[PDB]
């Protein structure tokens, strides 16, 4: 993870993928011909990832959100096969291949082309919705003499409001 992309490695699996395409290592390619060295995409194997977030059609947005809700997952990765993400899937004859619970983020926060996205911000916004606290009040008491007495009285006063009050002292740890 010290880079965006990684190295291309020639192995027996690269050879097998090239043979199916009619090519090998000493073959010369025609101008702009593309040869794949792997069967599937993955940044960790030397592939690429292009941000297309702003090119997705409104109907496709609606469908993707409906898929996550039908399968009941909050954070989800949906794998879609299509020739054109800017057109409705029904017109391009595209399909939804897989729904993945708990997906990774490298491809969205460190793409090789396009702009990086702040993926975490939408996660923290569901866990800690706007306007709500993430902390409880803390009252810390110190000094050479009188701490335990002051601590028990202060906890007693808050307790009269009906809240759960926890406290620590030199005698014990208490809750209500």
């Amino acid at each position: 993870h010290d880079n965006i992309l990684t190295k291309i490695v020639v192995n027996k699996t690269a050879i097998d993928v090239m043979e199916r395409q009619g090519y090998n290592l000493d073959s010369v390619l025609p101008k702009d011909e593309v040869v794949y060295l792997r069967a599937t995409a993955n940044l960790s194997t030397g592939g690429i990832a292009i941000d297309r977030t702003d090119d997705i059609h409104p109907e496709n947005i609606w469908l993707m959100e409906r898929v996550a809700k039908v399968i009941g997952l909050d954070i989800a990765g949906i794998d879609v096969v299509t020739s054109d993400i800017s057109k409705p899937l029904r017109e391009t004859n595209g399909v939804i291949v897989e729904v993945n619970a708990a997906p990774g983020f490298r491809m969205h926060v460190a793409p090789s082309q396009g702009l990086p996205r702040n993926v975490a911000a939408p996660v923290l916004d569901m866990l800690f919705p706007p306007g709500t606290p993430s902390r409880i009040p803390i009252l810390a008491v110190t000094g050479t003499n009188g701490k335990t007495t002051t601590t028990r009285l202060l906890a007693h006063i808050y307790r009269q409001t009906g809240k759960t009050v926890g406290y620590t002292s030199t005698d014990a740890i208490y809750i209500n």
């Binding site: 990765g77 708990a102 997906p103 990774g104 983020f105």
Partner: peptide, 4 residues
């Protein structure tokens, strides 16, 4: 399994 993680990062699917």
């Amino acid at each position: 399994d993680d990062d699917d």
